[PDB]
Every structure is written in C-alpha cells, then in structure tokens.
Amino acid sequence: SPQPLEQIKLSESQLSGRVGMIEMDLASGRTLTAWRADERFPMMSTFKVVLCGAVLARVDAGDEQLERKIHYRQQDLVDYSPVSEKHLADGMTVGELCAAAITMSDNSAANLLLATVGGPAGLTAFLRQIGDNVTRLDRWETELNEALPGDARDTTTPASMAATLRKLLTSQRLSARSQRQLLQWMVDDRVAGPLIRSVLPAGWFIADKTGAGERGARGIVALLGPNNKAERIVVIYLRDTPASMAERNQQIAGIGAALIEHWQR
Numbered sequence: 114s115p116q117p118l119e120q121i122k123l124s125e126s127q128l129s130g131r132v133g134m135i136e137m138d139l140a141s142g143r144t145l146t147a148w149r150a151d152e153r154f155p156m157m158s159t160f161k162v163v164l165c166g167a168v169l170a171r172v173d174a175g176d177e178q179l180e181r182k183i184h185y186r187q188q189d190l191v192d193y194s195p196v197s198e199k200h201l202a203d204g205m206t207v208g209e210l211c212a213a214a215i216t217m218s219d220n221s222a223a224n225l226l227l228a229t230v231g232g233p234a235g236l237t238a239f240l241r242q243i244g245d246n247v248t249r250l251d252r253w254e255t256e257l258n259e260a261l262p263g264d265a266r267d268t269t270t271p272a273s274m275a276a277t278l279r280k281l282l283t284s285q286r287l288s289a290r291s292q293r294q295l296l297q298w299m300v301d302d303r304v305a306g307p308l309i310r311s312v313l314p315a316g317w318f319i320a321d322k323t324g325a326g327e328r329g330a331r332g333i334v335a336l337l338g339p340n341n342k343a344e345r346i347v348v349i350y351l352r353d354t355p356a357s358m359a360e361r362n363q364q365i366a367g368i369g370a371a372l373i374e375h376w377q378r
C-alpha cells in the first residue's frame with residue numbers, strides 16, 4: 114500500500130471529499146502522523162464513546178450507577194434502536210445502555226444516556242471540563258448526523274478526538290475500573306469490530322467505534338497496535354463525498370491498511 118499520506122491523498126482525489134486522520138500513542142500522546150488533524154468533521158456515532166466516558170465520570174462521582182435501571186416508552190425511541198426497542202417492558206441498566214450505544218450504535222440508547230449527562234449541552238460542558246475546547250455536541254440522535262458544510266454543530270477534529278479519547282482511557286480522570294469499562298465496550302463493538310479483526314493481520318489488537326452521516330460522512334475511532342496491545346489511537350473521518358457507502362468503507366479500510374503496513378516505532 115502507499116505511504117499513509119499518499120493513500121489519504123488518493124482517497125480524497127477519488128472521493129472528492131475531505132479526510133481527517135491522526136495516529137497517536139495511547140500512553141504518551143506522541144503524534145505519529147496526521148492529516149487535516151485540526152480541521153472539523155462531524156463526529157456522527159463516534160460521539161457515543163465520549164458520551165459513555167461522561168456517564169462513567171458521573172458514576173465515579175457517585176452521581177450515577179451502571180446498575181441503575183431506566184424504564185422508557187415507545188415515544189422515546191428514535192431511528193435505529195435494535196437493542197433498546199426490545200426492552201420497552203423491562204428497561205435497560207445504564208451500563209447496558211452504554212453497551213448498546215457503543216457496541217450496536219443504538220440511537221435511543223445514546224439519547225437516553227445523553228439525557229442523564231445534561232443533553233448535548235451537558236456533554237459539551239463535560240468536554241470543556243477535561244480540557245477539550247474544540248469538540249461539541251449540540252443535537253440528539255439522529256439530527257446530529259446532518260453534516261451540513263460549515264456547521265460547527267456536533268463536530269470534533271481528529272487531534273481533539275484522539276486527545277480526548279486518550280484522556281478518557283488513560284489519564285486517571287476516570288477511575289481505574291471506569292477506564293477498563295470504556296475500553297471493554299470498544300473492544301466489544303459488534304458493528305465493525307469482528308469484520309475488521311477478520312481482515313487484520315495476526316497480532317493486531319482492535320477496539321473501535323464507527324459512525325456514519327449525511328453527505329458521505331463516515332468515520333472510525335480505534336485503538337490499534339501490533340503485539341496484541343492497544344498501542345495507538347487512530348481517528349479517521351470522511352466528509353462531503355457523493356461516493357457509495359461501499360467506496361467510503363473501502364477508502365477508510367485502505368487508509369487503515371496504509372497505516373498498518375507503514376507503522377513506525
């Protein structure tokens with residue numbers, strides 16, 4: 114495969130869209146490589162990881178419990194709720210909701226959790242508290258996927274998203290158990306995880322959350338490394354391309370392949 118930036122250029126040329134990318138050491142925050150890493154992209158469903166970071170923060174503070182059962186109504190549901198639509202009778206625990214939000218991309222699960230942290234405004238306040246002055250959530254599922262050009266709503270940058278994920282996973286802002294839990298949920302992704310793992314070379318650790326939006330928007334936040342270690346955070350976003358979903362997936366895959374083949378020490 115081409116060198117990562119070579120591949121990214123080919124991708125933008127072929128898609129007529131923008132790509133944003135960063136690869137960053139999990140432990141130290143050392144940036145290995147980056148492209149448009151300070152440009153804004155819609156987070157889409159990638160925000161679900163940050164959301165559950167916020168939820169875990171509330172658990173650590175004694176404001177919430179992963180065990181707490183939330184009961185909700187059919188009228189609370191939005192588009193794409195494969196897990197949550199199954200539990201109108203019995204409800205779901207906060208932890209179960211995070212699991213459904215991260216591992217199945219369940220939108221109503223996400224909205225229910227979003228309510229517990231003070232809505233988009235509350236999640237944005239949480240981001241500011243952990244020193245992310247860039248990322249912002251403004252809407253709920255599914256409006257937050259609108260991806261209007263020039264709209265700052267519901268956006269991050271690759272560099273801010275990677276820094277924030279690192280903060281959530283390793284900085285001891287969250288408790289030891291909470292850090293472990295957030296990791297677990299990403300390891301357990303059911304949307305793309307098993308497929309990615311199936312096509313990764315042997316020895317490569319994967320944990321991830323994907324996202325998709327309008328106008329071609331597509332993305333992934335991932336923990337990746339050789340030697341079965343979560344060595345690095347990789348963020349790849351795509352925006353403003355008329356291309357097929359198949360082509361968007363393949364391009365992100367080819368950028369991933371480039372990063373893997375050309376992994377530096």
Ligand SMILES: OC[C@H]1O[C@H](O[C@H]2[C@H](O)[C@@H](O)[C@H](OCCCCCCC3CCCCC3)O[C@@H]2CO)[C@H](O)[C@@H](O)[C@@H]1O
Nearest residue numbers: 309312313314333335337347365366369370371373374
């Ligand atoms: O020489 C290095 C490697 O090159 C290839 O491996 C390929 C593999 O055959 C392909 O299937 C994968 O696709 C990448 C997997 C796509 C998954 C999506 C990408 C995600 C991953 C997490 C962050 C970025 C986005 O690329 C690697 C690297 O070229 C060879 O098949 C393999 O034997 C060899 O060890």
Ligand SMILES: C[C@H]1CC(C)(C)OB(CNC(=O)/C(=N\OC(C)(C)C(=O)O)c2csc(N)n2)O1
Nearest residue numbers: 167168170171174176230231235236238239242
């Ligand atoms: C993820 C972050 C999001 C956010 C919103 C930054 O705050 B925290 C933690 N703090 C609170 O949730 C909180 N009240 O919690 C209870 C109700 C327990 C209380 O102490 O009264 C609160 C925040 S602003 C306001 N007026 N009240 O979670």
Ligand SMILES: CC(C)(O/N=C(\C(=O)NCB(O)O)c1csc(N)n1)C(=O)O
Nearest residue numbers: 157158159193218258304323324325326
């Ligand atoms: C699984 C996938 C593509 O997300 N799929 C969604 C969806 O609504 N995602 C919202 B997120 O990108 O804010 C969806 C709606 S109807 C349908 N089918 N899928 C993702 O998160 O990657």
